[PDB]
Design a protein around this ligand. Structure first.
Ligand SMILES: CCCCCCCCC[C@H](O)CC(=O)OC
Ligand SMILES: CCCCCCCCCC(=O)O
Lengths: 258, 259
């Protein structure tokens, strides 16, 4: 038994809270775990309008990474949109990361742009079901924030999870600032010397959405990781629908890339 | 003979609407209406504790909700621990809108045992306990400003009979509580027999509560008698975590009895 430090980074609308099943399994197995709230997520004190720059969204992860002595290595796990956060962390602090894990994560590289993966990810959320946008920059400006609706969550995100986790999410999801493509492209710049030197595992976890699976496959083709793993029977929130399986998989990954 | 009901759930200190998630799912699945509220600077409420030094602002999300309720709609109002103060004020202001009020290990002040007596006693069971700590944002010459629940205190006194994942959830979500002045609470929560006292009232005891001692709960029940006292065995302080199904069936029963 070697004690390891997992750092968990959530997706859009979510927070540290969404990892609670995983955090519990990690803590009782004796491992260190940090689940972070990104900007204006979970109980982070910022509101979405206060973090209109993508660097502001990422700062809780970047501050945490900065506070790490270089000898204290981590397994860095990014879920969906959280892939962009972990990619930035990989570029800035490549030495501190044993292995980065992309859980159906946006995984841009040199051959597939950060703005490319974003526009595609956004198309599957913007205008879907009961999702709605706000216009705090006024009616003649692009929409400012996106709010995940309860039907969208039930149908597209939590559709294989226990009903109580849907209720939990409905009480906790927060708006996402609609970051500009230009902002993101400038912020998430990746090089093969820094980002590319970090060991990288992709976990494919999706069901009943073959187009989403194709998007994940495309990112894997354009930016080949060191290893691809699969979890069956997962909805969009694998930490909710397949917690034991995700835990086992992360431990296996951690043990392989010490 | 299904009758659709409206449950309104009010959390305790440090918590938010999120703590009721198991109960919310059970209620929504059976077709009942349920609102789980965040009080000021709780859960995902946008205020920070320091921004809300007045107890009125802590309570405002409930009071605004109560005011916006449609004509002739009655609610089952459920308050957990500190949430008891909030529902008591709601009972005094809008007695007509409440079918029955449920105090779940709740602070239950009355005309004979006022809000400040109850608060001072509650404070002693939380302040200084294990790894709980206070902040001094107004400097050392002023009273402490906020109270922060510690992970050890949560594990030992609050979540000890709950699934370990619920403790993990809590530690990622608990927020500071502003240390509201006794004088402020006294002015905000004043209860009369013809208003507060006219609302049907049930107290639910958690048998293994290690946050609020039974001697204090016995004092409140005697000096401010409810219409009924119910019991959930093997429950820690957070009944909605440790005994969710039992709490649910009890709430339905209460709702059916006083409808
Ligand atoms: C004087 C005003 C300060 C209010 C004192 C806090 C009382 C908290 C009541 C419970 O004993 C603690 C709890 O609910 O567990 C999370
Ligand atoms: C143009 C920037 C795109 C912002 C929208 C990102 C939504 C991603 C949601 C998700 O992957 O769970």
């Amino acid at each position: 038994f070697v004690k390891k430090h997992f750092v968990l980074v959530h997706t859009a609308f979510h927070g540290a809270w969404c990892w609670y099943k995983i955090v519990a399994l990690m803590r009782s197995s004796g491992h260190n775990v940090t689940a972070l709230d990104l900007g204006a997520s979970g109980i982070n004190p910022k509101q979405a309008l206060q973090i209109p720059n993508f660097s502001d969204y990422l700062s809780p992860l970047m501050e945490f990474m900065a506070s790490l002595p270089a000898n204290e290595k981590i397994i860095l796990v990014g879920h969906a949109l959280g892939g962009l956060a972990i990619s930035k962390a990989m570029e800035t602090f490549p030495e501190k990361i044993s292995v980065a894990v992309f859980l159906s994560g946006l995984m841009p590289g040199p051959n597939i742009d950060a703005t490319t993966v974003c526009t595609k990810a956004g198309s599957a959320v913007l205008g879907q079901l009961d999702n709605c946008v706000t216009y705090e920059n006024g009616p003649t400006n692009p929409p400012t924030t996106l709010i995940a609706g309860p039907k969208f969550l039930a149908t597209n995100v939590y559709h294989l999870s226990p009903i109580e986790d849907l209720a939990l999410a409905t009480a906790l999801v927060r708006p996402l600032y609609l970051y500009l493509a230009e902002d993101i492209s400038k912020e998430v710049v990746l090089s093969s010397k820094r980002y590319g030197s970090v060991k990288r595992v992709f976990i494919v976890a999706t069901e009943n959405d073959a187009l989403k699976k194709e998007f994940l496959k495309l990112m894997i083709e354009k930016n080949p990781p060191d290893e691809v793993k699969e979890i069956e029977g997962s909805d969009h929130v694998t930490m909710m629908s397949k917690p034991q399986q995700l835990f086992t998989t992360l431990l296996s990954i951690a043990n392989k890339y010490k």
